[PDB]
Symmetry: D2
Subunit: 317 residues, 4 copies
C-alpha cells in the first residue's frame, strides 16, 4: 500500500488551510462522500438484492440525512422534493446544497452509467434560511461536482481553484486524487445530442449538426456519442473534449434539465475546466433562478466548439 495517500478530505483540507477558510466544507464533502459510497455499493449489487423509482428515493433520504448531520448546511434542494428542506437550528451551518441524488435511475435496468450531481452555495443573507437562499445565480457556487457510478466510481470536484478528479478505492473506501487540475481540449471531435428529437430542433442546432456531419471546410466529420445519461456524457466531454447539447425541443420548450442541480453544477465544472456553458443565448451561470426546479437549455464543452454554435445562434436571431 502507498503510505502517503491523497484522499479527497486531505486534498480539500490542504487547500482549505492554504486559505484559512471554512472547515465546514470538509465536514460537508466528507458526509457527501459517505452517501456516494453507499449509493455506489447499492448500484453495484442492484439486481441481486425498483431501480427507476425506489432506489432513487432511498438515495435521496441518505444524501439528506448525511448533509443534515455534517453541521454544515441550512437549505437543501433536491430533484425529489417539491419544496426546499430547511435544517434544524442545532444542526445548521452556512451552506445551501442543491442536488440530484441519482441522475438517470431508469438507466440502471440497462446498466448505463449514472451519477449524483451537487451544487454548493454559501447562504449570503442574514435572514432565517428559506428556499430564497437556493435561488442564487450559478456564478455564486462555492463548489459543485458529480459522482459517476460506472466501471469505476469517479467523484469530480470543481472549486474556485479548478477541476480535480478523485476515484474511489474499493478496498479502503476512500476517494483518491487521480487527476489534478483538469482543463478541457479547446476543440474536440465528438458532438453529443439525442438526434431522435431532430424534427423539433431550432435552425441553429440543425445547421451545426449537419456541419459536423458534412464539414464545410472539407475536413473529417465529428463522431457522435450519446450515452443518454448527463453525468456520463459530460464526463466524456470533460476528459475527451467535444460538445454536449440538450437544447429546447417540443416537450421541453425551456430545455429538459433542471437549472439548479444539473445544469449549473456541470456548467461550473465545465467553465472551471476552461470550457463554456450556454443556453444558446446567455451563459448558464448568469441565469438568476425563479423556481427551484426551473429548467434550462444547456450546451457545454470545448471553447472553440461552443463558440461555433454561438456564432450560428447569432446568424438566426
Amino acid at each position: 500500500f502507498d503510505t502517503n495517500i491523497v484522499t479527497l478530505t486531505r486534498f480539500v483540507m490542504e487547500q482549505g488551510r492554504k486559505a484559512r477558510g471554512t472547515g465546514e466544507m470538509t465536514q460537508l464533502l466528507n458526509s457527501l462522500c459517505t452517501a456516494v459510497k453507499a449509493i455506489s455499493t447499492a448500484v453495484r449489487k442492484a439486481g441481486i438484492a425498483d431501480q427507476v423509482k425506489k432506489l432513487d428515493v432511498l438515495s435521496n433520504d441518505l444524501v439528506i440525512n448525511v448533509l443534515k448531520s455534517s453541521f454544515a448546511t441550512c437549505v437543501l434542494v433536491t430533484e425529489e422534493d417539491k419544496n426546499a428542506i430547511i435544517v434544524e437550528p442545532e444542526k445548521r451551518g452556512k451552506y445551501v446544497v442543491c442536488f440530484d441524488p441519482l441522475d438517470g435511475s431508469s438507466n440502471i435496468d440497462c446498466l448505463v452509467s449514472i451519477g449524483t450531481i451537487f451544487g454548493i452555495y454559501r447562504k449570503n443573507s442574514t435572514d432565517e434560511p428559506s428556499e430564497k437562499d437556493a435561488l442564487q445565480p450559478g456564478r455564486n457556487l462555492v463548489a459543485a461536482g458529480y459522482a459517476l457510478y460506472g466501471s469505476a466510481t469517479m467523484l469530480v470536484l470543481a472549486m474556485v481553484n479548478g477541476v480535480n478528479c478523485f476515484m474511489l478505492d474499493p478496498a479502503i473506501g476512500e476517494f483518491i486524487l487521480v487527476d489534478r487540475n483538469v482543463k478541457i481540449k479547446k476543440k474536440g471531435s465528438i458532438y453529443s445530442i439525442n438526434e431522435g428529437y431532430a424534427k423539433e430542433f431550432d435552425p441553429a442546432i440543425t445547421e451545426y449538426i449537419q456541419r459536423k456531419k458534412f464539414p464545410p471546410d472539407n475536413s473529417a466529420p465529428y463522431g457522435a456519442r450519446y450515452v443518454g445519461s448527463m453525468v456520463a456524457d459530460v464526463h466524456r466531454t470533460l476528459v475527451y473534449g467535444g460538445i454536449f447539447m440538450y437544447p429546447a425541443n417540443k416537450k421541453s420548450p425551456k430545455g429538459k434539465l433542471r437549472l439548479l442541480y444539473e445544469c449549473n453544477p456541470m456548467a461550473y465544472v465545465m467553465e472551471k475546466a476552461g470550457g463554456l456553458a450556454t443556453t444558446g443565448k446567455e451563459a448558464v451561470l448568469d441565469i438568476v433562478p425563479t423556481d427551484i426546479h426551473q429548467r434550462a437549455p444547456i450546451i457545454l464543452g470545448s471553447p472553440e466548439d461552443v463558440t461555433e454554435l454561438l456564432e450560428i445562434y447569432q446568424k438566426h436571431a
Copy 2:
C-alpha cells in the same frame, strides 16, 4: 441466502443433461476467474498506458485461465495474429474466440467496456488448427459477454436460452438474476454513429430519416450510442431497439470482427428472439475465411430489423 444459483451450479446442472464430460463447466469456471480479475482491474483502473497494457494483461489472463481448464484446443484473440494452439498436455474439445477488453480506449471516459466470447466444438480428427475456428456462428455451442459497468454482468447464451448473472462483489460469485431473457418485438431506440452520415449506404440513410421523421406519424425514436458494442448491445437486449454498425465506406466491410464481436452478439440476439443481419444475409450463417474477418452488423428487436431489411429490398 442459503440456496444461491451461481454460474457454476447452473452450467453444471445443464451439463448433466447432456451426459457430457464436465469440460464446459471447467471452461466457464475458468473464464469467470478471469472476468472477476479484469473487473477489479477496471474498477481501480485510474488509481496510479491503460489501453495498451490493460488490454494486454486482460489477454494474457484469459489465455492462461483457458489453457488450464483442460477444455480448449484452439484460442482466437483480437490481440493475436494467429490462433493459439493449446499444448497436448492441456488440450480439450472446445475452440474459443474472444475479444478480451472490447473498446479498451473507452476506459479513460469511464465508458462501460466488456469481454465477448464465442465457444465452438472442434469436430474434426486431425491436429487442432485455426481451421477449427472457421465455422459459421450458427454452430456456436455457447456465447456471451461480460459487461464491466456500474455492476459486472455476465450474459450467457446456450441452446436452452439466454441467462444473466451478476457479480456479487462480496462473495466473488456470479449469481443468476435473469432467466431466459427474450427481447421485445419492437423497441423505441436506434443506435448508430451518425457522425458517419456521409458514408452511409442509402438504405441506412432512409431508415434513419424514417425514425426521426415518422411517415405514419408515430412517435419518433430515441437515439442512444454509447460507443461500446457491449453497452449498446446490452441495452438493445434489455430495452429493445436496433443497434447498427454497417459499412461506413472507410470500413467497407464494417469495423467489427466477425468471430469474436459480431457472431457472439448475434447468437445471443437470436437466442433471445432478435435478429442479426449484415443487411444482405444473417451474420450467423456467414462462413469465415479469415479468423480476423470483419462484417457489417444490424441487430436488435425483430420488427425493427425486419423494417430495415425491407428498406434494403427497396434499394435496387
Copy 3:
C-alpha cells in the same frame, strides 16, 4: 498477475492424476462458495442472536452447496442429530463430516473461528447411511479447515500433502500461498485451558509443570490458548508447539467431537509431520461407533507429543 493458482486449478490438476471423475473438484468448489459467504457474514457480523442464527445459516448453506455438487451422499453435521442422506438425484461418492462454524460463541469477542471438514469415500454398495461415515480418520481422503481471522485461510490436506490457500477478497478466489507445509519437529508453545487444572490426569499435570519449570534448565515454554480449535491448531501448524484438550473429567471423553473436529485436524497434522493422540492411541485409528462421539486430543510437533507420551507411560 496472469497465472494465478487457485484452489480449483490445484485440485483439478491433482484430480487428473488420479484418473478420476471430477467429483472432488465439484465438491471443494462448492465448499469454497460456502466458505466465502460465511467469511463475509462474519466480517460484518455485528453491523445490526449471532451464535444461534449465524451457525444455523452457516449449516444450511454448507448442506445446500454440498448437495448441489453432485458429489456427496452422506453429510454429518455438528448441528444435526442424524446424518443427512442426499437425494438420489443429487448423489455422488463422498461422505462429508463438517463443523460449519466451530466456536460460534467466540464471534462476540472477535476471536477467530472457522469451518472444519473431513471427506470420506463411501466404499460399500448398499444404501447410504450414517455407517458410511463411521470409518477411521486414517481413511479420510481429504480434510482441512477454513479460518475466518484477519485473513480467511483454507488449509487443505490430501494424500500428497498440506497446502494453504488465502482468500483474495478482490477476486473472491482462494490463491495458493503455501505449498506442502511441514510442521517443525519441536516448538516453544504449549496450549491448554489451564483453568481446568484440578481435573487434569497426573500425566498432563506433570508435563505442564515440566514446561514451566524445565528440569534440564532449558528455556520454558510460552503459553497461548485462543479458545478456538482452528486458531490454536493453525498456530501449532505454522509455529510448532503442542495443543491439548484431554479429558477434563467434566468431559471424561474430552470435549471435541471425533468425526468433525479431532479427525480433520489430526489428518492435517499427520500429513504435515506432526502427531495426534488421545494419550492412549492415535486418534486417526479410533473406530467410531457414534457420529457425534468425542475423543481427547493432544496434537502438534512430533518431539513435544512424544515427550507427553513418555510421561503417560511413566504413570502406572
Copy 4:
C-alpha cells in the same frame, strides 16, 4: 441500505457539537480511520502480496503521514521511533498522539488478531512542542482506543463520555456504531496471563492464579484464555469480562508493555468502561511518564476481580 448510518465521524461530531468543542478531533480521528482501513486491507491480503518487520514500518509511515495531514497534531510518539516526531508549523494543531501502529506484527504469520493502539493528549504547554508534551499522566488523555483487525475490524473509542464500539463496513469503507456505552461486567470468569512465565511470578500473582484454578470458597474455577496479542485479550476482557495481567517477570522487571501507547490507552478505555487498571501498586493512569518508551506492569479488567488481586498485593507488602 440503511439511509441513516451513524458513522464514527458523525458520532464524534454529534457529541462535539453538543459540547461546542474542538472540531480538530474529528479531522484527527477521520485521518486515523483512513490509516486503519488501509492497514486492515493490507493485513487481510497479507500472504498473497516480511510481516514481523516491514509491514509494521509501512503502517508506521502511513499513520504518521495521515496524522500530520489532519492539521490537528503537534507531537507524535510511536513505538517505532526513538524520539518523538514534531509536526511542521503550518501543519500543526493542538494534539499529541501516542501510538503503537501494529501491536503484535509477528502474530500475522500465525493469523492471530492484532491491532493499532492510540492515545490522544491535548498539548497543555504554551512552549514550542517537544517530547515533553507527550509525558503527561494517563489521566490527561482526551481520547484513546484501538483498532482490532480480526474476523471483522472493530475500532473501539473511549472518550470522556464512555466507551463506544464501531465496526468497519467492508462494503462502504465506514466504521459504523454498533455498541453504544460499554460497561464491563463487575466480576468475570476468565483470567488471561502467559503462564509460561510462572517460574518468575511474584507471590501475589502466583497466589491469585492458584486461587482461580482451585477456588477457596469451593466454587467453579476460572477459564484461562490467552491469545498473546494485547488488543485481542483486552477486547475479549472488555466484552466478556475477566482480568488480563501482564505483571513484571525476569526479562521484563518493570513489565513488558509500553506505558504511553499500549498500557495507558487500554487503561483509559478500561476505566471509562467501569473497570480498573493497576500496576499492582498505583493506578496505571496516574504514573507520570519519564521516558516516552517507558514500560509498565498492567493488570486490567472487571472491578471485582482487579480488587481481589489488589487485596492479595496488600497481603505481601
